[PDB]
Amino acid sequence: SSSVPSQKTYQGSYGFRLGFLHSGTAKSVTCTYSPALNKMFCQLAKTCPVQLWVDSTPPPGTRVRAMAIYKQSQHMTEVVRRCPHHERCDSDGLAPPQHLIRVEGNLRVEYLDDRNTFRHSVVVPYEPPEVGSDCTTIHYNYMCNSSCMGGMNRRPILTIITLEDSSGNLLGRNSFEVRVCACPGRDRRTEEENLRKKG
Amino acid sequence: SSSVPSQKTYQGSYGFRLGFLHSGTAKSVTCTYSPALNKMFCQLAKTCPVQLWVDSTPPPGTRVRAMAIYKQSQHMTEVVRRCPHHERCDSDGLAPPQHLIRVEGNLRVEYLDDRNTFRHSVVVPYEPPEVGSDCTTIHYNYMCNSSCMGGMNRRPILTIITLEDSSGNLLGRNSFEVRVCACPGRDRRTEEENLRKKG
Amino acid sequence: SSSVPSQKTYQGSYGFRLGFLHSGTAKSVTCTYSPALNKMFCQLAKTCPVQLWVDSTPPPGTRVRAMAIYKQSQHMTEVVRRCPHHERCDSDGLAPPQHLIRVEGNLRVEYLDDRNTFRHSVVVPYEPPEVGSDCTTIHYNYMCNSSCMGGMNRRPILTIITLEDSSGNLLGRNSFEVRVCACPGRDRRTEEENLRKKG
Amino acid sequence: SSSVPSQKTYQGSYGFRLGFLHSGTAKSVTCTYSPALNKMFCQLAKTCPVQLWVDSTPPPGTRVRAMAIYKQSQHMTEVVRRCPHHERCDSDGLAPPQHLIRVEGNLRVEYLDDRNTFRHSVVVPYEPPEVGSDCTTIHYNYMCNSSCMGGMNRRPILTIITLEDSSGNLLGRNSFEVRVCACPGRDRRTEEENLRKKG
DNA sequence: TGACATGCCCAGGCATGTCT
DNA sequence: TGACATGCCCAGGCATGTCT
Ligand SMILES: [Zn+2]
Ligand SMILES: [Zn+2]
Ligand SMILES: [Zn+2]
Ligand SMILES: [Zn+2]
């Protein structure tokens, strides 16, 4: 069992928050975000664009870390890992096969295994938006379904995104729930309806 | 891809056939056999008793081999193995972790990996029935569900039981289909009803 | 997992059979036998008298062995042992603390752990009945309840009694089911009624 | 028999009190707290989150200790230990197999056996809440059911949580009753109804 | 001896990747 | 996109040592 990183929102002095793209109505759209649930629904190994928005410019050398933790109290102290089947399959060259979350399209990506907690994380440099743009987008990939036997095993996860200075100070923190599934559109609509009818 | 052992019934000069125990009506009974389908339905890692019946006594040194093959033509040439999750879990001390089929309660069990075909099999000596008894019973275990991702992946298998002399001559061959599943009683009654209504 | 001793009745050339005493009607009588079920119901650590009847006199040096096996196919290959709580408690001086079945009142008792199967058994010399008597009685004790967690765990057992010559030849074999429980009278009456109503 | 640690509430100069999470309505929810009974109902080996609330910040080096005692006067002087079955089973690497209470997800956990009283306790450093949060949460696990034969044996326990400075001074003490059981929701609703109807 | 105890058994139906 | 798949969740009630 491992000590649990905080998931508490800390928008901080830089006004850090996340944004998500709108997507289509298909039963099996690749990535769709529910604001009511603060929850991403996405397919295995497909791009999940996450926007980073800030009110003030972070200092040079700021880093963006993503980490998954189990959402339920009963599972929080268990490290989130890829299942043995997917670990044994699809390497991009940098991500260790045991890591659930990857970043695509970034030459400065770093995959970390915490020496004390054993938890996995993936870090890229923070880059400010281009001229006229309001945010910076990172493309994450989740390499197992929420349902994978021997991995997440139908346990919901949170992704925690932290903005950190080069010294390691926490500048901001946000999180979102993730369901990696075959039919994100179906499952988002089911969970939203259950929220309305039974929540 | 691997060459495919015969599944053709050969009751042979010893009159070799299989028998199966009757079991209870529970939705999740541990092992239940359908004569109409020639199909065992059983749970993961639970005992599956298979009876060996002969009309004539096999010679000393006769051996009994069990091997799984996929039933569908499209999958026949693929070796049946345990999935990575269950391989990484439950060793009894003798069975290699990759083997699907084990025998319990036999000190002379041998687990074989074919040098040419890569197929797994498990062998025990043939023992004649005790006085007054009509058959000999072997207790097999199947160490994955038929549905296991990265293993059988919802593909039906046959188990091929061969009676072999010590020289390697085939004396008899029988086979039965297997579904390893959580609810053998439910699934047997579903498959028998589908046979009657749509077969 | 361990190879399974035969439980098949073999009354043999000596006409070997078991007999049991009649007992009282109390809900918690110490030992009561159901002929309809061929099943002893008895309390923990209390005397269970078992009679040995023969038609012909066994040879000098004949031995009487008792051994427990799980009755259900799914558990047959598991060695029957005392639970950790009762193992750690009540030694008579001869019985190893892991043995379920003891014999009381016999100076020539031998407790055996099979080198290959790991199964426990308890052996006493066969003694012919005294003049005018028809049988010989052995007093067995069962040192766990059928329900004990970490031991029998609510799994029914059979006791197998074998008559063996000094050379090791099997002269006769009989068996009976056992439920060790707090209320043998209650439980016998429940199981007999269930047999009549639902069997 | 062992001297009995105090269970008297002492909220102390730091205003120390416990808090508990709300949980779902399921018959077998993993952990549910009854304010009317000051009683946790939880399952074996599952996470039990306990919140530590203070009004004033404890000094550096403060420690949080948990210990179980039997609630009934007749059993208070008996040390609460794991039963022999569960002791012989599930080690996390740090907890001795005899200890009932474990802490998950803390690298600084210490398991203590008192030299004089023989009582077990588990200690972690006190950490103040993160920014904006009102409490600190510890995840305890209870490694036997209240009913375990040879352990708690259906005797209710209190868990005593003490806040202690590094010098050993008692800063605060709170306690709650615990029932570790298979069906916490069922049993909580039974005990609350008995309180209302017969208390 | 009656009846409470409490972990477990059991059937109904949700789950969710995949078939069509 | 509709609907089958199939391991799992869940509540009702049996279990069985013990309390009275
Ligand atoms: Zn996976
Ligand atoms: Zn598997
Ligand atoms: Zn016992
Ligand atoms: Zn226990």
XYZ file of N, CA, C and O in Angstrom, chain D residues 16 30 81 83 89 96:
24
model
N -9.108 18.003 19.945
C -8.972 16.831 19.089
C -10.279 16.041 19.064
O -10.836 15.704 20.109
N -18.530 -1.382 2.679
C -17.281 -1.811 3.304
C -17.052 -1.185 4.676
O -16.392 -1.797 5.528
N -6.100 -9.589 20.043
C -5.164 -10.119 19.057
C -5.903 -10.697 17.863
O -7.092 -11.011 17.938
N -6.931 -13.659 15.372
C -7.163 -15.078 15.589
C -6.086 -15.930 14.899
O -5.373 -15.460 14.003
N -2.576 -16.816 7.819
C -2.776 -16.438 6.427
C -1.641 -15.537 5.966
O -1.366 -14.513 6.588
N 3.115 -6.986 12.079
C 3.236 -8.344 12.598
C 1.927 -9.083 12.407
O 0.841 -8.488 12.492
